[PDB]
Amino acid sequence: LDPLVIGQDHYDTARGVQYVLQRYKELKDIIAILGMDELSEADKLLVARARKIQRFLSQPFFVAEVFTGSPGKYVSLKDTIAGFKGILNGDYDHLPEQAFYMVGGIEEAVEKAKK
Amino acid sequence: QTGYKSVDAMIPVGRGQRELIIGDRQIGKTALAVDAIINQKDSGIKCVYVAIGQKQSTIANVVRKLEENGALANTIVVAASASESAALQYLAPYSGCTMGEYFRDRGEDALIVYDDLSKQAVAYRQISLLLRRPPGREAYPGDVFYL
Amino acid sequence: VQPNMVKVLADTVVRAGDLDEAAAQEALKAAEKALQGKGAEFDYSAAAARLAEAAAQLR
Amino acid sequence: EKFRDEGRDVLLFIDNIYRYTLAGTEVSALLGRMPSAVGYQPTLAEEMGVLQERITSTKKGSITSIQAVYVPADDLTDPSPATTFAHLDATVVLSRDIASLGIYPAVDPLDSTSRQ
Amino acid sequence: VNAGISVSRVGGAAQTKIIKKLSGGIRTALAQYRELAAFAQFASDLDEATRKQLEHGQRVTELMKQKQYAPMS
Amino acid sequence: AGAKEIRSKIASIKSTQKITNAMEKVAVSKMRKAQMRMAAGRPYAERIRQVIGHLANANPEYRHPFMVEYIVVSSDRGLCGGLNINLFKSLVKDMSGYREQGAEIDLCVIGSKGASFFRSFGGNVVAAISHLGEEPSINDLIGSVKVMLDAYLEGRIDRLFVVSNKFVNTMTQKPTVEQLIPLHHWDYLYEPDAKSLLDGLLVRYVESQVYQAVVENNACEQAARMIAMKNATDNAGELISDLQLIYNKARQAAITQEISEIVGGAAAV
Ligand SMILES: Nc1ncnc2c1ncn2[C@@H]1O[C@H](COP(=O)(O)OP(=O)(O)OP(=O)(O)O)[C@@H](O)[C@H]1O
Ligand SMILES: [Mg+2]
């Protein structure tokens, strides 16, 4: 995980995903007692992107279709970067959180959001 | 088949599997395991019940419920109660397992219940600390996993 | 006024139009903002559901 | 035990079962035995079982026991409370609030429980 | 039984066909109910979709209840 | 890290729980004050409805525009149980029907949270006021109301509606929208003219329904806050209960470690 090994684009997408989750972890106690509605406008937006990122990190495996029954997914490094970069930029702010859970690629989240 | 719709539909048990029954005290852990033994009175699976560190009155009640339900003729009951030696409580699960293995080695099917595997660990900890053997996490011996 | 009953629907301040007229300009003044928009701003339902769901978890 | 053999139902009151556990911890330390979890004696469950298993309903009579229980640091997971609760059939809780109301028996109907 | 963390690693291959097919719709209903159970008291005015899931969730939960010493075939 | 940090966190949560307990009772008291201020305005509204009714009927030759073919109320403090969101979720639903039908929409904002919802989405406004006391006075609403009544007279607005929560009960705050504009045997003596009086009565009636709406929303704010502070107190207890289990584990673990070290050193010396 170094700019000289993987390139700046991948390194920035990862640094950005981590930055978002870290801040969400810090807000946990306030939301636990007062809820999400007391947060600042920017904090509410991050908490929303942090939640989508959390479920887009989920993936059905080919060794787990026996446990669940859903089919496995293989995601390339190119598709992985494109999906998280889009959620961080806000290109997917109109989809429900549950459209990102177990969807493999981002296009499947767009097609999952149609239901 | 345990005979419980929740368990048999969502948490199925297959012949040869090890399925842990975990929870706090007084929630039906024994109830679930004894009903699973009672349901094998017509399946053809012989059953064994190992009571480790239990009260004598609790052991007596379970045996009566097994005979009242027609399941005692298929069951072997191995008892090491709360006042018996720690050595007997630590060895009872291996004795019951040996009795259950008699059926598995001859091409037959068997079911074994260990009433409190946490009471076997407490009995083995007592013997280990009385032989002056160095303790680890929560004062348990170093080979508690292997037990 | 009626034969049986007399009602006085009494005001709590001078109702001179100028006062309300000033009051209206004062409210108009407070309504001025840097991003007035077009008037067709919408699609908040996604956000309204996102916060509504968090409010369910809160209770 | 003698009265039970006579053909009677007997009450055995133990002033405090925690002090029975502590006396066992003290004796175990004096004899030089290696201490267990939270500093209790390695024989904690066996010493409790040897006492509690004699209190039962036989085919001649029945010894029923009322035992006062103390909880160290208000922790119900501590080895002494944990071991004792394994041999209890009922729990009677006496409430300071109920006493103020004027009900002298003072047993809390919501906190008190029985396996029967 | 807590259907959220209770699991069988080799059980899938052991169920009979009838129970393996019919059990499909039971665990999912309890999962859908897990997210609405506490909030259910003020969900009578929410979207019809949520109400269908909640109605089913309260039913399936009730059906899973069973008694001691009474095994079903 | 250890038992030291958990004690500070259990004390921190216990202090906050005691004040949120009081704030629920303070809120209940303020709810009862706002409910009597609601009832001290019904007589002026029920009698003016009768007069505006009969006066039109005996004077059919005059048909005021208000009688032929949004004001939004929000809080100034937080701690509400999503009371502002639930109304703002009904404001967006009705506005959609009109945007689909093709009409434009002008808005009047009373309170701080209403302004926040519009600055956060670049929404339009024609009038606005906030910082109204928990005890509001009708005189403050006159300015904001006037910017809206003239519109309807100048045709700048075809219909006017008040958006506020309604105090259904101590546990229920129904978000609602109602139309402000448009709306026996014997006859009255008119001084100076009937038309002169109808124009005066209709403004007093709309400014009255707006004041009725603000006061009721304040009663809703107090009730919503009561439930939120109850929820916060309960949630705090759950955290205290969970932390206490972790503290007991840390306490028991610290004792076993020390004994091992004492025994270990004594088994060498
Ligand atoms: N299906 C059931 N219907 C009614 N009561 C039940 C049911 N299942 C269990 N119980 C009751 O739960 C109580 C505790 O059950 P049980 O003694 O088997 O639990 P346990 O976990 O093994 O307790 P222990 O720790 O003492 O061994 C008993 O009173 C039992 O009758
Ligand atoms: Mg048991």
Q: Which residues pair with D14 in a beta bridge?
A: D67
Contact D35 F248 (CB under 8 A): no
Written as one letter, the residue type at E60 is V
Quick check: CB of B25 below 6 Å from ligand 1?
A: yes
Q: Are B98 and B68 in contact (CB under 8 A)?
A: no
- Provide the residue count of chain B: 147
Is E9 among the catalytic positions?
Answer: yes
- Cα C27 to chain center, whole Å? 10
- At F177 the three-state DSSP class reads strand
- Cα F103 to chain center, whole Å? 27
Quick check: CB of B65 below 6 Å from ligand 1?
A: no
* DSSP of D50-109: HHHTTSSB-SS-EEEEEE----GGG-TTSHHHHHHHTT-SEE--B-HHHHHHT-TT-B-T
Sole residue written with tokens 């404001």: F91
- Run of H or E including F29: helix F3-39
Residues on chain F touching D75 (C-beta within 8 angstroms): 248, 251-252
Quick check: CB of E69 below 6 Å from ligand 1?
A: no
Residues on chain E touching C57 (C-beta within 8 angstroms): 39
Cα–Cα distances (Å) from F47 to B50, D54, E37, F179, F208, in that order, read: 85, 86, 48, 20, 12
Smallest Cα distance from E45 to chain B, Å:
31
Query: Is B25 within any annotated ligand binding site?
Result: yes
Contact residues for F85 (Cβ-Cβ < 8 A; gap 6+): A37, C48, C51, C52, C55
Sole residue written with tokens 């004041």: F211
- Long-range CB contact pairs, F154-157, < 8 A, 24+: F156/F106, F157/F106
> Which atom of ligand 1 is nearest to B34's Cα?
18
Dihedral pair phi/psi, residue F173, rounded to 5°: -125, 85
- Closest Cα to atom 27, ligand 1: which residue? B30
Q: Are E8 and B12 in contact (CB under 8 A)?
A: yes
Distance (Å, whole) CA D41 – CA D29: 8
CA atoms within 13 A on the CB side of E65: 5
> Quick one: which of A90, A89, A88, A87 has its CA closest to A100?
A87
Method used to obtain the model: cryo-EM
Distance (Å, whole) CA A69 – CA E24: 10
- Run of H or E including E14: none
CB atoms within 10 A of CB C4: 5
Sole residue written with tokens 């076997």: B120
Sole residue written with tokens 């139309």: F179
Distance (Å, whole) CA E50 – CA E36: 9
Cα–Cα distances (Å) from F73 to F121, F186, F205, in that order, read: 18, 40, 18
- At E9 the three-state DSSP class reads coil
Phi-psi region of B20 (alpha: psi -120 to 50; beta: other; left: phi over 0): beta
* DSSP of chain B: --S-HHHHHHS---TT-------SSSSSHHHHHHHHHHGGGTTS-EEEEEEEEE-HHHHHHHHHHHHHTT-GGGEEEEEEETTS-HHHHHHHHHHHHHHHHHHHHTT--EEEEES-HHHHHHHHHHHHHHTTPPP-GGG--TTTTT-
Dihedral pair phi/psi, residue D90, rounded to 5°: -150, 155
Q: Which of B26, B55, B130 sits opposite D87 (nearest CB)?
A: B55
Q: Which residues pair with F169 in a beta bridge?
A: F172
The sign of the CA dihedral B60, B62, B68, B72 is: negative
Contact residues for F264 (Cβ-Cβ < 8 A; gap 6+): B134
Burial class (CB in 10 A: 0-12, 13-18, 19+), B99: middle
- Closest Cα to atom 26, ligand 1: which residue? B26
Pair of tokens at residue D3: 């009265």
Distance (Å, whole) CA A51 – CA A47: 6
Buried b vs exposed e over A13-39: b needs ≥16 C-beta within 10 Å?
A: beebbeebbeebeebeeebbbbbbbeb
* DSSP of F195-257: HHHHHHHHHHHHHHHHHHHHHHHHHHHHHHHHHHHHHHHHHHHHHHHHHHHHHHHHHHHHHHH
Distance (Å, whole) CA A83 – CA A106: 5
- At F59 the three-state DSSP class reads coil
Distance (Å, whole) CA D97 – CA D95: 5
CA angle C51, A41, F24 (to 5 degrees): 60
- At F99 the three-state DSSP class reads helix
Query: Is B24 within any annotated ligand binding site?
Result: yes
Distance (Å, whole) CA B123 – CA B91: 9
Sole residue written with tokens 């008694």: E67
Q: Are D46 and D99 in contact (CB under 8 A)?
A: no
Q: Is the peptide bond before F182 cis (omega within 30 degrees of 0)?
A: yes
The sign of the CA dihedral D43, D47, D50, D53 is: negative
The four Cα atoms B23, B24, B25, B28 give a dihedral, to 10 degrees, of: -30
Pair of tokens at residue D12: 């055995």
Contact D38 F252 (CB under 8 A): yes
Q: Is the peptide bond before F192 cis (omega within 30 degrees of 0)?
A: yes
The four Cα atoms D36, D42, D47, D48 give a dihedral, to 10 degrees, of: 30
Sole residue written with tokens 């502590």: D22
Contact residues for A102 (Cβ-Cβ < 8 A; gap 6+): A58, A59, A60, A70
Buried b vs exposed e over F34-61: b needs ≥16 C-beta within 10 Å?
A: bbebeeebeebeeebeebbeebbeebee
Query: Is B3 within any annotated ligand binding site?
Result: no
CA angle B9, B15, B20 (to 5 degrees): 65
CA angle F255, F260, F265 (to 5 degrees): 130
> Quick one: which of F70, F72, F74, F126 has its CA closest to F103?
F70
Distance (Å, whole) CA F45 – CA F212: 9
